[PDB]
From Swiss-Prot:
Membrane topology summary: Lipid-anchor
Naturally occurring in which organism (per UniProt): Acinetobacter baumannii
Name used for this protein in its record: Beta-lactamase OXA-58
Annotated PROSITE patterns: BETA_LACTAMASE_D, PROKAR_LIPOPROTEIN
Underlying gene: OXA-58
Residues at the catalytic site: S46 (acyl-ester intermediate)
UniProt modified residues of type N6-carboxylysine: K49
Localisation per UniProt entry: Cell membrane
Amino acid sequence: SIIDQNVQALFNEISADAVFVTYDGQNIKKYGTHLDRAKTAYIPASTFKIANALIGLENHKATSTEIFKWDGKPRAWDKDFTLGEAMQASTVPVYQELARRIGPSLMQSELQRIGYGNMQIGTEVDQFWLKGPLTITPIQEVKFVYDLAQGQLPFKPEVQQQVKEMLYVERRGENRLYAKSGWGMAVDPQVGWYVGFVEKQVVAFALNMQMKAGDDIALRKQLSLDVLDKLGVFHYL
């Protein structure tokens, strides 16, 4: 139980309300300073690129090799991107284009079919994950990416594999970290995400915390890695 205590003391210096959820396919565990966040719905922000990529590839609106060309309008995003490149750079305009290719009718039925969050897209097909009304709980996120890791989402296995590897961050020996960050700036309060999984057996995780303008952009990932290390899920080299 000192493992749990070590994790909790990490959050002790973090002033922002935070929860960190893990899921190993059987047990949900919750850490942080405000555990109720785990069952509160928030906008997915850029964590929604996982579901967007899946829906896009599944419905033949893009391939993982296709290049989304820069249109010359300044946005490091000022270049051509594959979905994979755009995933890691978190290039919002690229995924907005993908959403526009899917269209509101397909996006709506797909989110309903897979049961993603509250499954609400409103009237703007390229804004709903950034401004609402789409919301999802951290627990929902961890179960979602857990299924992705296992190829058990309701998509073609090849589609799940392609998106899975777009999330690949690093390996340590044989252990692999997959992750996607998010920062919903257009909502009040702002929400920060770091969701992913470690493939050893799979342990999915979701950091979910309050954000404010000026916050360190690297904190989400460093905090998450520190926690995964303390839990012994992904030890530092």
